Amino acid sequence: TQRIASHSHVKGLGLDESGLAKQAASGLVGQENAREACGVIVELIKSKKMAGRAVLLAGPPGTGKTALALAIAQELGSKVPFCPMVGSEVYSTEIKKTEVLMENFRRAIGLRIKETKEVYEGEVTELTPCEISHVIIGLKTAKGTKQLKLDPSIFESLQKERVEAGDVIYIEANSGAVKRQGRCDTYATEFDLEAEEYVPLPKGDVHKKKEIIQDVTLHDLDVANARPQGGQDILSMMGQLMKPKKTEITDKLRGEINKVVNKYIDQGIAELVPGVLFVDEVHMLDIECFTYLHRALESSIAPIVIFASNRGNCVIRGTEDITSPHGIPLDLLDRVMIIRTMLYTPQEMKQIIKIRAQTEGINISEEALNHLGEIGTKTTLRYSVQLLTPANLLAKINGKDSIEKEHVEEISELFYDAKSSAKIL
Amino acid sequence: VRLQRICNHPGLVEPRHPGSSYVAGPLEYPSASLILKALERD
Amino acid sequence: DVTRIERIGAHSHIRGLGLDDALEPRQASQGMVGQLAARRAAGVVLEMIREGKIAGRAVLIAGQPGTGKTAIAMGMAQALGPDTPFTAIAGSEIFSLEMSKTEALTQAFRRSIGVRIKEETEIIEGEVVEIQLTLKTTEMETIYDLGTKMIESLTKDKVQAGDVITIDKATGKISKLGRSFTRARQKRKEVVHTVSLHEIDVINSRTQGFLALFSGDTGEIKSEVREQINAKVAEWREEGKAEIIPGVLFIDEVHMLDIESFSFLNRALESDMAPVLIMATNRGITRIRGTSYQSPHGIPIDLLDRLLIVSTTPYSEKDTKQILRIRCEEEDVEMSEDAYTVLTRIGLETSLRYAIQLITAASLVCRKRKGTEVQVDDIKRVYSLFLDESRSTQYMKEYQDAFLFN
Amino acid sequence: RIERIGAHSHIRGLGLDDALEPRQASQGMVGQLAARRAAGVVLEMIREGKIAGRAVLIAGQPGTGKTAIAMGMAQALGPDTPFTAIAGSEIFSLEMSKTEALTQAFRRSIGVRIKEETEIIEGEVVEIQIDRPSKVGKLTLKTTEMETIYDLGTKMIESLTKDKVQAGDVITIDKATGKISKLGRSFTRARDYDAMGSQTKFVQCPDGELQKRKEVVHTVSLHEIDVINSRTQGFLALFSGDTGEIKSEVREQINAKVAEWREEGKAEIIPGVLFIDEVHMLDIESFSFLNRALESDMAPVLIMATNRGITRIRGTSYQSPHGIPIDLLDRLLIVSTTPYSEKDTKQILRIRCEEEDVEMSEDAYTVLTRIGLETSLRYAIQLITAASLVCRKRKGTEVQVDDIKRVYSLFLDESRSTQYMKEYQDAFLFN
Amino acid sequence: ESPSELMLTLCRCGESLQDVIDRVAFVIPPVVAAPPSLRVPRPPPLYSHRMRILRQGLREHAAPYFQQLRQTTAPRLLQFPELRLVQFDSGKLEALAILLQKLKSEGRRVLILSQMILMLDILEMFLNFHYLTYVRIDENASSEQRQELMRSFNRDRRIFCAILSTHSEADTVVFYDNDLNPVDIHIYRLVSGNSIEEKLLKNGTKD
Numbered sequence A: 001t002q003r004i005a006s007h008s009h010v011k012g013l014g015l016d017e018s019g020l021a022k023q024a025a026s027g028l029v030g031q032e033n034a035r036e037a038c039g040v041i042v043e044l045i046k047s048k049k050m051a052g053r054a055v056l057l058a059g060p061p062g063t064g065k066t067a068l069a070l071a072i073a074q075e076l077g078s079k080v081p082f083c084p085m086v087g088s089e090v091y092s093t094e095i096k097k098t099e100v101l102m103e104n105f106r107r108a109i110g111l112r113i114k115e116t117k118e119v120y121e122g123e124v125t126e127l128t129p130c131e132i133s134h135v136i137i138g139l140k141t142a143k144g145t146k147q148l149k150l151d152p153s154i155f156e157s158l159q160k161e162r163v164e165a166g167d168v169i170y171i172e173a174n175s176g177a178v179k180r181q182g183r184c185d186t187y188a189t190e191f192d193l194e195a196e197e198y199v200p201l202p203k204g205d206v207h208k209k210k211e212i213i214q215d216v217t218l219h220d221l222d223v224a225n226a227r228p229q230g231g232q233d234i235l236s237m238m239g240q241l242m243k244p245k246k247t248e249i250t251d252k253l254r255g256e257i258n259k260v261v262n263k264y265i266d267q268g269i270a271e272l273v274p275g276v277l278f279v280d281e282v283h284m285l286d287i288e289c290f291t292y293l294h295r296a297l298e299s300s301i302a303p304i305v306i307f308a309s310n311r312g313n314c315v316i317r318g319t320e321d322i323t324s325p326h327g328i329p330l331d332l333l334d335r336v337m338i339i340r341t342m343l344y345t346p347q348e349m350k351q352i353i354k355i356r357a358q359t360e361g362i363n364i365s366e367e368a369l370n371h372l373g374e375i376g377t378k379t380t381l382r383y384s385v386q387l388l389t390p391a392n393l394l395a396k397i398n399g400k401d402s403i404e405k406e407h408v409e410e411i412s413e414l415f416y417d418a419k420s421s422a423k424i425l
Numbered sequence B: 001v002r003l004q005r006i007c008n009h010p011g012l013v014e015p016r017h018p019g020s021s022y023v024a025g026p027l028e029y030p031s032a033s034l035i036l037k038a039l040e041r042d
Numbered sequence C: 001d002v003t004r005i006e007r008i009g010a011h012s013h014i015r016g017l018g019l020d021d022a023l024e025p026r027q028a029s030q031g032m033v034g035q036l037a038a039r040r041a042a043g044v045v046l047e048m049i050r051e052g053k054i055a056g057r058a059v060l061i062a063g064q065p066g067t068g069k070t071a072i073a074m075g076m077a078q079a080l081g082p083d084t085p086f087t088a089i090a091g092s093e094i095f096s097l098e099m100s101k102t103e104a105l106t107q108a109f110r111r112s113i114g115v116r117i118k119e120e121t122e123i124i125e126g127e128v129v130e131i132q133l134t135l136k137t138t139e140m141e142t143i144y145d146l147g148t149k150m151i152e153s154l155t156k157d158k159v160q161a162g163d164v165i166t167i168d169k170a171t172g173k174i175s176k177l178g179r180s181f182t183r184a185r186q187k188r189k190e191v192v193h194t195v196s197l198h199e200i201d202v203i204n205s206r207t208q209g210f211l212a213l214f215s216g217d218t219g220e221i222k223s224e225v226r227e228q229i230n231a232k233v234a235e236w237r238e239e240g241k242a243e244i245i246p247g248v249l250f251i252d253e254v255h256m257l258d259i260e261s262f263s264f265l266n267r268a269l270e271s272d273m274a275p276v277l278i279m280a281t282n283r284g285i286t287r288i289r290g291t292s293y294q295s296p297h298g299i300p301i302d303l304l305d306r307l308l309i310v311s312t313t314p315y316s317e318k319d320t321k322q323i324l325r326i327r328c329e330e331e332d333v334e335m336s337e338d339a340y341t342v343l344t345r346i347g348l349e350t351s352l353r354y355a356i357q358l359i360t361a362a363s364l365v366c367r368k369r370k371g372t373e374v375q376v377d378d379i380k381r382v383y384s385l386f387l388d389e390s391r392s393t394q395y396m397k398e399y400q401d402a403f404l405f406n
Numbered sequence D: 001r002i003e004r005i006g007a008h009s010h011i012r013g014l015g016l017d018d019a020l021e022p023r024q025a026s027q028g029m030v031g032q033l034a035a036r037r038a039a040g041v042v043l044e045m046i047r048e049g050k051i052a053g054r055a056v057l058i059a060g061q062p063g064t065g066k067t068a069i070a071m072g073m074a075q076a077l078g079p080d081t082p083f084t085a086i087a088g089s090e091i092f093s094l095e096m097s098k099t100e101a102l103t104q105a106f107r108r109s110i111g112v113r114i115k116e117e118t119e120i121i122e123g124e125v126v127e128i129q130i131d132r133p134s135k136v137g138k139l140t141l142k143t144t145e146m147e148t149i150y151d152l153g154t155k156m157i158e159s160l161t162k163d164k165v166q167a168g169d170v171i172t173i174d175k176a177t178g179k180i181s182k183l184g185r186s187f188t189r190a191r192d193y194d195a196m197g198s199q200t201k202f203v204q205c206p207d208g209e210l211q212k213r214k215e216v217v218h219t220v221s222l223h224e225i226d227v228i229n230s231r232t233q234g235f236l237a238l239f240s241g242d243t244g245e246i247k248s249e250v251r252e253q254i255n256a257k258v259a260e261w262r263e264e265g266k267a268e269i270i271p272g273v274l275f276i277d278e279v280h281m282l283d284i285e286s287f288s289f290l291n292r293a294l295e296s297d298m299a300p301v302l303i304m305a306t307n308r309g310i311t312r313i314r315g316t317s318y319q320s321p322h323g324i325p326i327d328l329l330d331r332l333l334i335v336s337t338t339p340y341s342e343k344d345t346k347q348i349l350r351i352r353c354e355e356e357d358v359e360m361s362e363d364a365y366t367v368l369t370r371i372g373l374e375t376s377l378r379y380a381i382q383l384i385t386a387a388s389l390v391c392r393k394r395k396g397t398e399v400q401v402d403d404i405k406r407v408y409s410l411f412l413d414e415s416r417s418t419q420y421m422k423e424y425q426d427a428f429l430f431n
Numbered sequence E: 001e002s003p004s005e006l007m008l009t010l011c012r013c014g015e016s017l018q019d020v021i022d023r024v025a026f027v028i029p030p031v032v033a034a035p036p037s038l039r040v041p042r043p044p045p046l047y048s049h050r051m052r053i054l055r056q057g058l059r060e061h062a063a064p065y066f067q068q069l070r071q072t073t074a075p076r077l078l079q080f081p082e083l084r085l086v087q088f089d090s091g092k093l094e095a096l097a098i099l100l101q102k103l104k105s106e107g108r109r110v111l112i113l114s115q116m117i118l119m120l121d122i123l124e125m126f127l128n129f130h131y132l133t134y135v136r137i138d139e140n141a142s143s144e145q146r147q148e149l150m151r152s153f154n155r156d157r158r159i160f161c162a163i164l165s166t167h168s169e170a171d172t173v174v175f176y177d178n179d180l181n182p183v184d185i186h187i188y189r190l191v192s193g194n195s196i197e198e199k200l201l202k203n204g205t206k207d
Ligand SMILES: Nc1ncnc2c1ncn2[C@@H]1O[C@H](COP(=O)(O)OP(=O)(O)O)[C@@H](O)[C@H]1O
Pocket: A006, A027, A028, A029, A030, A059, A060, A061, A062, A063, A064, A065, A066, A067, A068, A308, A309, A310, A352, A382, A385
């Protein structure tokens, strides 16, 4: 099976229908306050009506805030869109960071569309290029045969298809996408070592139009419009060949796109589905980023945002003198929820250790479990988790299967924690 | 009926289909030809 | 339920201006209440905008955070209505690597202004069922002379029986916009367009500047085209072939502007074709951007001198109750008035934002309770599970050691 | 041959027995036996390849083989497994954001192996006749077992006539591709004419039946797939390295498609290994970004090296152990290296002398070992070849301790250089 | 001056420079959009003349290499996973492939049996994928067509394999499906029954 990461055990928030947090469920423990709060938030987004609300998490480092976001995603299913990122990626060498944030917000939302589409394929019978415009193409298929006018654009496409007759093609009127499928299977015997392959005549009508539940983000709508790879005019082609550099997108484009999407919704064909945006290490953002967040969260179309930080009241990035709680400016802090996190005790450590051991499926002595819980009490939890694989390797190499205290101590003197290094540095 | 489909081939039903991309309609902008009537002193 | 792109907004409630016809305040209407002095000042400024006889006047709105100056600005914007240009942009959008700095502010200004123009065009059609000249018609038929592109194009055109697009009789262009008068089942009009100088300049800049509009790519258009187009606009104004409708502009968080920005603003305001401008900022005495100078709101003294100010004041208790009830009905949530009172208290101690936040959480909690009316118990539980600024600051201060750098 | 005797050429592995006990000498290595144990465990776990995202750091005195340990690891790993070593200063670039650079390195480290069946034939060019007017063609081949005769395809005709193959040659053609390849001429093929033409060797006639199916396997890295499909003719940029801001939607689309290809036996992934040197050269931004860069499943194990102690965090004023924020520190484990002992130094220098192929006196060994111990090992390593050159200038073979003293006097060392700078402080400006 | 040794493979295990390209390239944009077209009333004929002159200039200049340029920057819009899917679709085709390879090693003409009409088309896909011969037998064909097909089979030995419509000479066939009506080769029935699909062929009674 695919590899297993640290945050793989997580599968669900572990709440109960009543709205409470079961002590042991879906790979979670303790922090009933946080678990029920996440329940409230997931219900809020399930409302699918509120827009612009935002929340933040905090607490001791390595308490699973990332795990909480992941579990929210787990219980959210797949239909709703989702997007992670970090403060570091905001800095770019292509466009301003404001535009990076706005692009993120645009792609947080999702869209779903039911689309017509009209196709044309068959076996090429003839190709009469009467007067360019009058390019009639005769197509043969098991159902029968037809011949229809053509667009000189598709004429050039066919030219470039290297197709004459007795071969299979595939034409879509909307995109005008032109394509070949090798040669017909009728000519499977003329020669013996002719290179090109063969496929049989289509078993359906030349014409067919089928609907499809397509889904796209508003970000992709904007970007697809911005740089018109579509079209075929030579001026457009030349515009395409130029280097693909991403550019800041004018907001008038945004407004027109919003209007057109409103029209599409009024057609009843398309239905909207907002997403949730998760941002990690928000403290890494500068003062300008928070300044623009102030306005960005105001929009009537902004999806729900989440944050994360593991820092005290320290200096503010891009500010270098003011200190604010968690480093986030107090003004922006005024605009957000707050959800905290506790610390743990040895028993919870034993519980989570059992969970992880099952996750990677390793037999272990209960004494080793006790000693490892003691170590975690002394050290950080992440340090305790990291010891599992070396212990397993020690067990396997020596031929035994379950882990014992001897292997635990062996790993102990093999590797040391940060504080151990510091005291010996 | 539904025994033989799976017993022989699942593609016999729900035939695998090749995806594609959306062909958005073109974008238009109203204006007046007067934008160019002048600016050509000559 | 069915939703448009927009949804419940943080400041959706407002729809206009709670102003009397005599530019006087009515205590509560249009989704806003209180702050009567700012209300009258904003009415005066909006009247200035309507008149538009003066050129490029500037105003600033101060006040401690929380006082919804953005609310006032959005109320102004609604009051203007969808007939005059209005531009709103925060302070950080100004820094863009694509173009230089002064260029970005100059483009902003030239975008804010607006030029209107109406035009006419005669277009008539005949009900031609056959798609092939023989301009089949039911009102009055024409066999007028035949072109070439029209002949080779309309013949192969795909159209339903009796359908009649509003084709250009005056020209013949295939304009597939109109419908059939009666076959399937004329007005020169005054086509009115709105345009800004940022549109005219980019359109004339190159062969396809309209592409650059959407692409947001063009940078540093030479000032020569700018001045020439200004001359062209003026000489169209004089001849009556065109008219101007001076728009407006809004900026936010001007405290986050460089000193060079303020100097360029001081120059540019002096110009003639400057749309009216509005500002926004909260802090009091603060350091200016780029140096150690402490200045009122961190704005250069000279720029302040050539600018006016209007202040706001906190909300009293009953003001808070009024705002709470209006936003509670806005969200369509119904409370027990004891809940109203306890929540109003809490909001007074903590903040306005905290209450505007708690309302929806309480609504959802009650939905889980399956009731329709929320009481104090639910609010207390919600406030227990989530924290405000002060409570979180404290809780850190107990765990200060855990959190790094503290 | 392009290689040359390098400082770390003497390294050939790690010298660990099956139970991972290091051997006091093996494939050019000895010392830091605890470090050798830990490294053996790491290599074993890499072979297991059942887990992702693990990270480890190596700290110790400078010039204590940390790079040597890493290179022995890389050698023992083998070429099949992808590997890549980079320097901290290298990420800082004027073409891309740092985060994009880190993503590029990560994706480079991981590799993908594609398996696919083949269908080909090969044999002598027994006879050919082409019949230009389209062109009619007839041809036959054979092998060491039987013979056959076939018609000729029109596109086959163009292919071969551009190939201009000579009858009697040995070649192989794939039906689907219809692309031919010459695999070496044969006795009759290169028997040629009376006319000179050319001269060439021969190859043995093929064997087995003409048709052979056969399976081919390939390998490519994730970043390579990203780049090739990114710009649609961004392929040539692979060499130019001009790729910029490879968008995230592309990343996720590739991840989805590769996963689905994976669980269907189409191909097999392989968790590569990535090593970064002078990790302290990273700022706080890179620490933040990579801190989460380990959760993504496609996470090759990371190895870091740095000798600092309680140093200012790059880009700020914060002292931290080795200048790495504690958030990362708790996410990884450490290994320490001790300064070397006396006799082990003798062994190391004898190994390096063997490397250089210069064999000299025992008193020279004693004196040079003591001098290097007092000053540093690296200066001794420098003096090795210098003494070799001096002795060869003497026209003898055995280097003598007097020659060692001569060369030592010739090339002052660090301590002597600072002592000199002291001898005249005002010699050089800005003191 | 002109080393131009060769464009070396990018570590693709021997072959390279096209197989990697056509194996890896699969990306499709989520959306494709046309260029925006400005809407103006009657425009000046002078701008029209200038832009049309530009439209003339662009070609001829591009004409000689307009074609070569046009093959590129035409981003793929869709794909078609091959019968490699058959791997995860039906164990029948993958499991038989080996025995069909054995038969091709031997060299008997092989007629194949089945009942579903669409399974015939799928098996035709299979045949094409393996690069073998074929001949289709259906029920829409008339009797003279049936006998002409038999004549094609017998007169021509070039074909190697054939498919029979269940409705109604060589020495290689194997059953495929089940039915209720009566109407040295080894017949390895297509029974992928590791479950009740065995009893599914055993009794065939009212119960
Ligand atoms: N209920 C839980 N069960 C198991 N592990 C947990 C739980 N809560 C937190 N963790 C641990 O927290 C770690 C993740 O920490 P992380 O979220 O990155 O730190 P922070 O919470 O400061 O962002 C994981 O290794 C996970 O094992």
